[PDB]
Amino acid sequence: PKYTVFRIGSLFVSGREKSVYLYCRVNGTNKIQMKWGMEARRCLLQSM
Amino acid sequence: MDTFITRNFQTTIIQKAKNTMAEFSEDPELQPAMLFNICVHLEVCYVISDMNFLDEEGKAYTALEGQGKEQNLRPQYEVIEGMPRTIAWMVQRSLAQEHGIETPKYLADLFDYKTKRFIEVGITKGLADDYFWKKKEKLGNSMELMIFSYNQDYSLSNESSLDEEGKGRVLSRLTELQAELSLKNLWQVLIGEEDVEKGIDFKLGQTISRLRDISVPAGFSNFEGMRSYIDNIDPKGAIERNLARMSPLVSVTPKKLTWEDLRPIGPHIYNHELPEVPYNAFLLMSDELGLANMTEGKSKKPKTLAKECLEKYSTLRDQTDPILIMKSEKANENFLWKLWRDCVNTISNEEMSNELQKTNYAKWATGDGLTYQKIMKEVAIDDETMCQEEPKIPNKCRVAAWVQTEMNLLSTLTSKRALDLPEIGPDVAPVEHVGSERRKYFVNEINYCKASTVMMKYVLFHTSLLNESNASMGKYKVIPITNRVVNEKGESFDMLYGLAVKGQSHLRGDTDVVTVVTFEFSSTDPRVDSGKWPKYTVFRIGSLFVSGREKSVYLYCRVNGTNKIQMKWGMEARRCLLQSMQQMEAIVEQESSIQGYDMTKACFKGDRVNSPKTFSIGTQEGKLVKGSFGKALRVIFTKCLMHYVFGNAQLEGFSAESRRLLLLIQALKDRKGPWVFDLEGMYSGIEECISNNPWVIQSAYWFNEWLGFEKEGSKV
Amino acid sequence: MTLAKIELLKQLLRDNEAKTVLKQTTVDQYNIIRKFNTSRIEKNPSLRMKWAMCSNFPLALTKGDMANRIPLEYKGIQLKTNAEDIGTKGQMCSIAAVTWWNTYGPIGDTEGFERVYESFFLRKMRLDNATWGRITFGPVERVRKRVLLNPLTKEMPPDEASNVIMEILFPKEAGIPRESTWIHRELIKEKREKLKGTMITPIVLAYMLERELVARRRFLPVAGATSAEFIEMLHCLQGENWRQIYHPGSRSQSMIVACRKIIRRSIVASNPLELAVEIANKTVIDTEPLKSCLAAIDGGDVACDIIRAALGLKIRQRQRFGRLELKRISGRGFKNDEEILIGNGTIQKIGIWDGEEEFHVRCGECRGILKKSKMKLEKLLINSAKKEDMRDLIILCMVFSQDTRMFQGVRGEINFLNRAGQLLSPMYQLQRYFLNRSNDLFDQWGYEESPKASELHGINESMNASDYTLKGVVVTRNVIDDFSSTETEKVSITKNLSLIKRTGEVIMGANDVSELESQAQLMITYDTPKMWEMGTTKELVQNTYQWVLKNLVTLKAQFLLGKEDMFQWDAFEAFESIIPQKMAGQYSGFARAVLKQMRDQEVMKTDQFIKLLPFCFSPPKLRSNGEPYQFLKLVLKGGGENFIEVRKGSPLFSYNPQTEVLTICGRMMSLKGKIEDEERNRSMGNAVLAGFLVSGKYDPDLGDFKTIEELEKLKPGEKANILLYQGKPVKVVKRKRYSALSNDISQGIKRQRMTVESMG
Amino acid sequence: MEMGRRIHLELRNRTPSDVKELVLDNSRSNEGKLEGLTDEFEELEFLSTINVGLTSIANLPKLNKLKKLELSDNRVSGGLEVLAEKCPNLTHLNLSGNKIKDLSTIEPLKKLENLKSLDLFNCEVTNLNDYRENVFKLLPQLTYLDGYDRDDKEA
């Protein structure tokens, strides 16, 4: 309900045409959110 | 014509036609018709030569486009037209030698390989047969002929040379060209390949030639002489030669303008020997007495409203013994009183009709019968006593006092509001929200000023007058001076301000005058200031209590005349409101330009950061006084209303000519050092308009006072 | 009514005046006849309307059967009268009947308003979905500009607009469709279908279409966006001391690129004009030749102006020098040749302008006034618009002024050329040198004290609004409005594409175009082999397929005959350049065999035919035994995504039969279906009376005339008797083909110049 | 348009045993069936049924030569075991765009041994953990799938 989607073209993988859509979405985040995303690599240590 | 050639022809064909014309030393610009003919010739030749090819066997056939067959793709027709004359001649000779055919004595247009012949293509506006025979005679049988006409007919030497499609296409192009020319009207102007060597013919007759001969400047004796003189003689400093001898007594007389030169305009108003200016406005403004009746809100015919208003006040309705306070100079007390009594009886009559029941007494009360009888010119010529009336110039009056008091009083808030405006659609954009806030802040101020009520009364009276005049033409009518007033509590009082008898308005033209007599209720006894009312015959028809304080009630009666122009402008007097808002809007906008936010609340009432805006509005004892933003808006609105009510030729001549001094003062205040050429001329022009208009005299007085203030304040 | 028409005509003719005037004035003169009205125009409409509204029956009703729906007096209120009329010969009525009709009466059809008044509802849609923002109360700088008041579906000149309107809503009187209906065939068919099913009076529709097509332009004070969408709301958006944020609810770049490419292609050859115009009128942008957007916008880039001059169109007469648009104000400059030493030490013989002159100068968003004397710049006034634009303006005006300081400021060398490899005049060489190295004449130009004044403020060499400005340059904090009297004066075109005034003076030079490449945002489909041997493989494939698609009828017809002439077409030679040499022959043989099998043992299949035809240009190389090689994946130059699938589709080519659509190089095109039925559906636009040519006069042998519907019944090559325009009986022949006058003229010119060269 | 019209156009009013392929696309069907194909058909190799609104597989001629069949954009959700009793010679199966709920729907394909390629795109069953592996061990006869068994080859 929050995405704006187009249809740009079609790719071929095994001789078969598969469509390609472009999900365009506006978003808002701050520098601290950038730091949180950067630290999101800690999921590896968490799972371990 | 050249525009048509550019539009309907490709640049390539135009270039080829121009080259061909240059080869013949013929100017394309001077013979646009010939250029068009050459372009059409080239286009038809190319159209003929296209699409036609020869197969290997040599049989004519069609070849597709954008689809080549190696290199040759030999076309059926080789175009010879359009090449340079030398190149075309050489190509024709080469083809003749190669195919073993006789070389034509005249250059050909196309060559057909199939028939192995030289083909000439021609066009004409006349019959195809005639042009075909002419061309055959000129050229002979050595060349095949193909002539097409603009009327969808053609002459072909051989009918198999071109297929149906080619002839159809060439004819379609020719017909389209003809239709486009006819639409552009160039068809008639267009002249064919036999008349294009003549040009337009427009020669002057005998009388016009003689008029031209005698209408030549001094020193000449014939228009040929002037034409030759203008075409040949060269002036190389004639202006300086003339200036070197022109007298030095002619010059703009440039004199720098200082504050001292500016003097008060119209000093004669100060002089006390002249009479006080009278009240010449159509209706009373600051003296109107409103017979007010509370009503649920129903809108009713003015006659019924006046009937009910008088019914409430039985004492004034039934008053029948007047007490003449003053009969001005000429009007008759008996006529006016009897006419007013007939007015009251007609208004209070049971019948809905609002036309005078006498129809004969009013004829002499209004003075309709006191008119001259027009005779034919012959008797006037013969008679010696039929002279010409001397022009009646307006009186030269002095500054009155009622104008200032009315200016003050009409510009004050009153608990009563009448000005109401229709709704508009919801405001969704921020800009229209700001506009709505400003509009509300303005109407909250203007609505409660008495000038708004006076303006609405004038508008309603003139609307009713126009409606009555259009509906009723040759019968005397009774018209209440009605208004509607809503108080702060929402009670929609209906106010009757008087009555008016309308005369006979049967007028074909607009400038024709129609007479109306106005009787107006008022609470002012004229004896307090008799100089304001020299045009009014008044009574004393009783007294009334507003809240317990008894005050008299008089009836001001006066005969007047209007016309359809002023009658319409009465209903267009509402534009004063617009004039009041525009300027203030600009003012507010200027403030908004300074600091970012919106100030319409700050200028009007002020806020914690900015003080309320105050202008300079009045004065007292030589001390100028400030005034709130709302009061300044009221002053501007009243100024516009007065500009209307007291408007005539004098007001226009005064304003449009004192604007010169206004702009000169504005320039001086900015230290632009304005210079003037003839100051006394401007002053005389301005002051030849201050004769008898009360607003003009008061405008002159205020201008002088403000100029004195500016002079005293210029010291800094 | 036709009987009433003939009876009225007979009664009118019974008088001798009608007989003599009708038989005297031709159809063309009718206009004059119509204009001889009384002209007793009302002196004051307000008073007249006021009086009329109070009259018993001011409304002038047209005689008809509608009145019977309403009584002459309803609910004791008089509505209409049966008294005769002299002014209009109808009846009289009052607004009471109008209000009752709005209340009760016949109920009409609501469909027509969905499409008929499309422009108004589009205006409402753009208003409703618009998003508003803040209000900036600060002062707003506004420039006077020539702006289009309202958006247009397809901007066209007034004459083309009128012809299109007639071709839309006047099926009769459509003689000889011009070279304008084919350009606007899509608009013709769209509007025709939309307006069908209505009953509104034709004049209303004609006026609405004129509004929707004919452009309306005016001088307005604008600040910010300038598209018609913003101009519609300019009354609210703008403001002398207030501004509002507004967002209302392409082809230009493509045309710029196409015009530049055409200019570069034509210049390198001799006689550039004919080749350039051939390519211009043979080009197309996705539905229409280049004379569909060039004729739309006013002026444009120098390349577009030069092409329009080569074509038939009106161009603003501003003098283009590099990027500068110059408008002379006064003075006459004598162009005299002179020998001047350049700062590099070399000596050049070039033309210099003796005498003083002044020009309004524009460049991008920068406007200014320049005053120059011979061999010196004197004064320059500018407004702060943009750093890049201001620098370009300063440098270009510097070079144009031919100031001795500019010559003495050269430090490198001047031997440059263009993309076509030509040596330019020293003026344009200096222009390129200085633009490439902006900090060359700026350093040695010299500085001048700041313009001490209330508003006049200086600008430094770095374009920052810094004091200690350049000698002469001045930036005023005001609005400079220039370029008045856009006369579009007559301008000639030389063969070398360089324009000239009515006199011999040159306005636009062939080298004014800037050598900057971009990407066409649209399918730039040409029709000539010479053009498209520049771009990438994808462009070549797309253009070849478009060429095949456009002339599908001819190729399909030639397919039935079964001859090799069909395959040896020049259009495929360029395609040969993008097929591997070592394997192209095998592709040609395989495709030839497949298409022979298609012709022999099956029926029409357009998609595979189009897919397989182009590869057969090269000669085949059959198997040693003789059989053709078999493939299913045709590789193309560049590898990877540059490949064609024989079976169903690939990135460059895919046709879906479920919806019967064609996708070529990532672009969907509508193949309605197959068959001459789909051919005629493509021809569903065109123009009434487009398949018939004119030949002969009335020729009464056919008896009475026949309608368009009965005209179509005639087989090709027949003769029919028709009426052209307002009457004008003529004889016509049904066409067996479709024509293109531009193609014929271009081929004729090509043959003529081939002959000239061969003789030479 | 109807299945009958497509049959007539493809067969061109000839004997049923003259074409080894059919194209039943964009054809409206009665309650989601594949009528118009009589049991008299004896030779058929390729099939194509797209946008036919087929809801179940219960009407199909018995065959012994078909090797490919194509179903897509349908709301069919039911056991496919009937294919074994109708034509146990399928090699290419395409269910792209169909509506299948869980893994159990594709179970009945075990009894078929000639199937080598199966297609299931944007299917509700396709969005599961180890769906690729689970299907593979559930249909050992399968040699191909949506295209990435081990490599990429074309039908």
PDB file of N, CA and C in Angstrom, chain D residues 19-70:
ATOM      1  N   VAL D  19      -4.022 -32.854 -37.056  1.00  0.00           N
ATOM      2  CA  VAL D  19      -3.140 -31.908 -36.384  1.00  0.00           C
ATOM      3  C   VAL D  19      -2.678 -32.528 -35.074  1.00  0.00           C
ATOM      4  N   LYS D  20      -1.390 -32.379 -34.776  1.00  0.00           N
ATOM      5  CA  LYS D  20      -0.796 -32.915 -33.559  1.00  0.00           C
ATOM      6  C   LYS D  20      -0.626 -31.854 -32.478  1.00  0.00           C
ATOM      7  N   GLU D  21      -1.235 -30.683 -32.649  1.00  0.00           N
ATOM      8  CA  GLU D  21      -1.120 -29.611 -31.671  1.00  0.00           C
ATOM      9  C   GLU D  21      -2.417 -28.816 -31.652  1.00  0.00           C
ATOM     10  N   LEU D  22      -2.635 -28.109 -30.545  1.00  0.00           N
ATOM     11  CA  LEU D  22      -3.811 -27.271 -30.372  1.00  0.00           C
ATOM     12  C   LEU D  22      -3.409 -25.983 -29.671  1.00  0.00           C
ATOM     13  N   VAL D  23      -4.173 -24.923 -29.929  1.00  0.00           N
ATOM     14  CA  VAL D  23      -3.969 -23.623 -29.289  1.00  0.00           C
ATOM     15  C   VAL D  23      -5.342 -23.153 -28.818  1.00  0.00           C
ATOM     16  N   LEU D  24      -5.671 -23.442 -27.561  1.00  0.00           N
ATOM     17  CA  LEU D  24      -6.917 -23.003 -26.939  1.00  0.00           C
ATOM     18  C   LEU D  24      -6.579 -21.878 -25.965  1.00  0.00           C
ATOM     19  N   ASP D  25      -6.481 -20.661 -26.492  1.00  0.00           N
ATOM     20  CA  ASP D  25      -6.091 -19.499 -25.708  1.00  0.00           C
ATOM     21  C   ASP D  25      -7.153 -18.415 -25.814  1.00  0.00           C
ATOM     22  N   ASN D  26      -7.335 -17.682 -24.715  1.00  0.00           N
ATOM     23  CA  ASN D  26      -8.307 -16.592 -24.654  1.00  0.00           C
ATOM     24  C   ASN D  26      -9.702 -17.081 -25.035  1.00  0.00           C
ATOM     25  N   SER D  27     -10.053 -18.276 -24.567  1.00  0.00           N
ATOM     26  CA  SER D  27     -11.330 -18.904 -24.878  1.00  0.00           C
ATOM     27  C   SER D  27     -12.157 -19.026 -23.609  1.00  0.00           C
ATOM     28  N   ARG D  28     -13.382 -18.510 -23.652  1.00  0.00           N
ATOM     29  CA  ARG D  28     -14.296 -18.662 -22.530  1.00  0.00           C
ATOM     30  C   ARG D  28     -14.790 -20.100 -22.452  1.00  0.00           C
ATOM     31  N   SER D  29     -14.917 -20.610 -21.230  1.00  0.00           N
ATOM     32  CA  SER D  29     -15.305 -21.993 -20.999  1.00  0.00           C
ATOM     33  C   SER D  29     -16.491 -22.049 -20.048  1.00  0.00           C
ATOM     34  N   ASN D  30     -17.302 -23.091 -20.208  1.00  0.00           N
ATOM     35  CA  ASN D  30     -18.500 -23.276 -19.394  1.00  0.00           C
ATOM     36  C   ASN D  30     -18.097 -23.832 -18.034  1.00  0.00           C
ATOM     37  N   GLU D  31     -18.211 -23.004 -16.996  1.00  0.00           N
ATOM     38  CA  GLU D  31     -17.906 -23.413 -15.626  1.00  0.00           C
ATOM     39  C   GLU D  31     -16.462 -23.887 -15.486  1.00  0.00           C
ATOM     40  N   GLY D  32     -15.575 -23.380 -16.336  1.00  0.00           N
ATOM     41  CA  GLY D  32     -14.170 -23.728 -16.255  1.00  0.00           C
ATOM     42  C   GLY D  32     -13.867 -25.149 -16.677  1.00  0.00           C
ATOM     43  N   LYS D  33     -14.042 -25.440 -17.963  1.00  0.00           N
ATOM     44  CA  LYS D  33     -13.736 -26.742 -18.538  1.00  0.00           C
ATOM     45  C   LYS D  33     -12.985 -26.531 -19.848  1.00  0.00           C
ATOM     46  N   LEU D  34     -12.689 -27.630 -20.537  1.00  0.00           N
ATOM     47  CA  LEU D  34     -11.986 -27.600 -21.817  1.00  0.00           C
ATOM     48  C   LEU D  34     -12.793 -28.339 -22.875  1.00  0.00           C
ATOM     49  N   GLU D  35     -14.088 -28.040 -22.939  1.00  0.00           N
ATOM     50  CA  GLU D  35     -14.952 -28.658 -23.930  1.00  0.00           C
ATOM     51  C   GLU D  35     -14.506 -28.265 -25.339  1.00  0.00           C
ATOM     52  N   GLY D  36     -15.138 -28.888 -26.331  1.00  0.00           N
ATOM     53  CA  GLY D  36     -14.780 -28.687 -27.716  1.00  0.00           C
ATOM     54  C   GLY D  36     -13.705 -29.618 -28.231  1.00  0.00           C
ATOM     55  N   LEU D  37     -13.128 -30.453 -27.369  1.00  0.00           N
ATOM     56  CA  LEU D  37     -12.116 -31.434 -27.754  1.00  0.00           C
ATOM     57  C   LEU D  37     -12.706 -32.816 -27.498  1.00  0.00           C
ATOM     58  N   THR D  38     -13.204 -33.451 -28.556  1.00  0.00           N
ATOM     59  CA  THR D  38     -13.862 -34.740 -28.419  1.00  0.00           C
ATOM     60  C   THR D  38     -12.844 -35.841 -28.128  1.00  0.00           C
ATOM     61  N   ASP D  39     -13.342 -36.932 -27.542  1.00  0.00           N
ATOM     62  CA  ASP D  39     -12.495 -38.071 -27.215  1.00  0.00           C
ATOM     63  C   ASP D  39     -11.955 -38.778 -28.449  1.00  0.00           C
ATOM     64  N   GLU D  40     -12.502 -38.494 -29.634  1.00  0.00           N
ATOM     65  CA  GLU D  40     -12.058 -39.159 -30.852  1.00  0.00           C
ATOM     66  C   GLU D  40     -10.624 -38.811 -31.227  1.00  0.00           C
ATOM     67  N   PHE D  41     -10.046 -37.767 -30.636  1.00  0.00           N
ATOM     68  CA  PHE D  41      -8.663 -37.416 -30.929  1.00  0.00           C
ATOM     69  C   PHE D  41      -7.741 -38.581 -30.592  1.00  0.00           C
ATOM     70  N   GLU D  42      -6.845 -38.908 -31.521  1.00  0.00           N
ATOM     71  CA  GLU D  42      -5.906 -40.008 -31.349  1.00  0.00           C
ATOM     72  C   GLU D  42      -4.448 -39.580 -31.378  1.00  0.00           C
ATOM     73  N   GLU D  43      -4.109 -38.519 -32.106  1.00  0.00           N
ATOM     74  CA  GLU D  43      -2.734 -38.047 -32.227  1.00  0.00           C
ATOM     75  C   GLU D  43      -2.667 -36.597 -31.771  1.00  0.00           C
ATOM     76  N   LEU D  44      -1.804 -36.327 -30.796  1.00  0.00           N
ATOM     77  CA  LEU D  44      -1.594 -34.979 -30.293  1.00  0.00           C
ATOM     78  C   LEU D  44      -0.245 -34.940 -29.592  1.00  0.00           C
ATOM     79  N   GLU D  45       0.515 -33.876 -29.840  1.00  0.00           N
ATOM     80  CA  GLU D  45       1.856 -33.723 -29.285  1.00  0.00           C
ATOM     81  C   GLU D  45       1.968 -32.520 -28.363  1.00  0.00           C
ATOM     82  N   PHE D  46       1.557 -31.341 -28.818  1.00  0.00           N
ATOM     83  CA  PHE D  46       1.653 -30.114 -28.045  1.00  0.00           C
ATOM     84  C   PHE D  46       0.262 -29.613 -27.681  1.00  0.00           C
ATOM     85  N   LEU D  47       0.170 -28.965 -26.521  1.00  0.00           N
ATOM     86  CA  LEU D  47      -1.070 -28.371 -26.046  1.00  0.00           C
ATOM     87  C   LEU D  47      -0.783 -26.974 -25.517  1.00  0.00           C
ATOM     88  N   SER D  48      -1.810 -26.128 -25.533  1.00  0.00           N
ATOM     89  CA  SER D  48      -1.671 -24.747 -25.078  1.00  0.00           C
ATOM     90  C   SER D  48      -3.030 -24.272 -24.585  1.00  0.00           C
ATOM     91  N   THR D  49      -3.143 -24.049 -23.278  1.00  0.00           N
ATOM     92  CA  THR D  49      -4.371 -23.549 -22.663  1.00  0.00           C
ATOM     93  C   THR D  49      -4.001 -22.422 -21.710  1.00  0.00           C
ATOM     94  N   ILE D  50      -4.264 -21.184 -22.122  1.00  0.00           N
ATOM     95  CA  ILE D  50      -3.943 -20.002 -21.333  1.00  0.00           C
ATOM     96  C   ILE D  50      -5.172 -19.107 -21.278  1.00  0.00           C
ATOM     97  N   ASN D  51      -5.438 -18.547 -20.097  1.00  0.00           N
ATOM     98  CA  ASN D  51      -6.566 -17.638 -19.898  1.00  0.00           C
ATOM     99  C   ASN D  51      -7.885 -18.302 -20.289  1.00  0.00           C
ATOM    100  N   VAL D  52      -8.001 -19.600 -19.997  1.00  0.00           N
ATOM    101  CA  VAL D  52      -9.218 -20.352 -20.281  1.00  0.00           C
ATOM    102  C   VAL D  52     -10.114 -20.487 -19.060  1.00  0.00           C
ATOM    103  N   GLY D  53      -9.669 -20.022 -17.898  1.00  0.00           N
ATOM    104  CA  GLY D  53     -10.477 -20.131 -16.694  1.00  0.00           C
ATOM    105  C   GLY D  53     -10.762 -21.561 -16.294  1.00  0.00           C
ATOM    106  N   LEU D  54      -9.814 -22.463 -16.530  1.00  0.00           N
ATOM    107  CA  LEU D  54      -9.993 -23.867 -16.188  1.00  0.00           C
ATOM    108  C   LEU D  54      -9.849 -24.040 -14.681  1.00  0.00           C
ATOM    109  N   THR D  55     -10.872 -24.612 -14.049  1.00  0.00           N
ATOM    110  CA  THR D  55     -10.899 -24.783 -12.603  1.00  0.00           C
ATOM    111  C   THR D  55     -10.604 -26.210 -12.163  1.00  0.00           C
ATOM    112  N   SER D  56     -10.702 -27.184 -13.065  1.00  0.00           N
ATOM    113  CA  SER D  56     -10.436 -28.570 -12.713  1.00  0.00           C
ATOM    114  C   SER D  56     -10.061 -29.330 -13.974  1.00  0.00           C
ATOM    115  N   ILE D  57      -9.416 -30.477 -13.773  1.00  0.00           N
ATOM    116  CA  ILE D  57      -9.036 -31.356 -14.872  1.00  0.00           C
ATOM    117  C   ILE D  57      -9.848 -32.638 -14.763  1.00  0.00           C
ATOM    118  N   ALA D  58     -10.991 -32.680 -15.449  1.00  0.00           N
ATOM    119  CA  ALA D  58     -11.855 -33.851 -15.424  1.00  0.00           C
ATOM    120  C   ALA D  58     -12.335 -34.274 -16.804  1.00  0.00           C
ATOM    121  N   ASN D  59     -12.080 -33.484 -17.846  1.00  0.00           N
ATOM    122  CA  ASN D  59     -12.492 -33.805 -19.208  1.00  0.00           C
ATOM    123  C   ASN D  59     -11.269 -33.702 -20.108  1.00  0.00           C
ATOM    124  N   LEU D  60     -10.780 -34.845 -20.581  1.00  0.00           N
ATOM    125  CA  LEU D  60      -9.609 -34.877 -21.447  1.00  0.00           C
ATOM    126  C   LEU D  60      -9.568 -36.199 -22.205  1.00  0.00           C
ATOM    127  N   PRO D  61      -9.414 -36.181 -23.529  1.00  0.00           N
ATOM    128  CA  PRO D  61      -9.326 -37.446 -24.269  1.00  0.00           C
ATOM    129  C   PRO D  61      -8.154 -38.291 -23.797  1.00  0.00           C
ATOM    130  N   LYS D  62      -8.356 -39.607 -23.798  1.00  0.00           N
ATOM    131  CA  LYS D  62      -7.265 -40.525 -23.508  1.00  0.00           C
ATOM    132  C   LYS D  62      -6.269 -40.504 -24.660  1.00  0.00           C
ATOM    133  N   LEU D  63      -4.986 -40.382 -24.330  1.00  0.00           N
ATOM    134  CA  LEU D  63      -3.953 -40.177 -25.333  1.00  0.00           C
ATOM    135  C   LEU D  63      -2.708 -40.966 -24.957  1.00  0.00           C
ATOM    136  N   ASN D  64      -1.884 -41.242 -25.973  1.00  0.00           N
ATOM    137  CA  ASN D  64      -0.636 -41.966 -25.767  1.00  0.00           C
ATOM    138  C   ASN D  64       0.521 -41.365 -26.559  1.00  0.00           C
ATOM    139  N   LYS D  65       0.361 -40.161 -27.116  1.00  0.00           N
ATOM    140  CA  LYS D  65       1.415 -39.517 -27.888  1.00  0.00           C
ATOM    141  C   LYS D  65       1.744 -38.105 -27.423  1.00  0.00           C
ATOM    142  N   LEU D  66       0.944 -37.509 -26.543  1.00  0.00           N
ATOM    143  CA  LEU D  66       1.232 -36.163 -26.068  1.00  0.00           C
ATOM    144  C   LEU D  66       2.489 -36.159 -25.209  1.00  0.00           C
ATOM    145  N   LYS D  67       3.340 -35.156 -25.428  1.00  0.00           N
ATOM    146  CA  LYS D  67       4.559 -34.982 -24.654  1.00  0.00           C
ATOM    147  C   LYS D  67       4.647 -33.643 -23.939  1.00  0.00           C
ATOM    148  N   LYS D  68       3.873 -32.642 -24.354  1.00  0.00           N
ATOM    149  CA  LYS D  68       3.896 -31.328 -23.726  1.00  0.00           C
ATOM    150  C   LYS D  68       2.470 -30.844 -23.517  1.00  0.00           C
ATOM    151  N   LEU D  69       2.258 -30.119 -22.421  1.00  0.00           N
ATOM    152  CA  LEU D  69       0.972 -29.501 -22.132  1.00  0.00           C
ATOM    153  C   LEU D  69       1.229 -28.216 -21.361  1.00  0.00           C
ATOM    154  N   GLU D  70       0.428 -27.189 -21.644  1.00  0.00           N
ATOM    155  CA  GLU D  70       0.647 -25.853 -21.100  1.00  0.00           C
ATOM    156  C   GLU D  70      -0.638 -25.343 -20.465  1.00  0.00           C
TER     157      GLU D  70
END
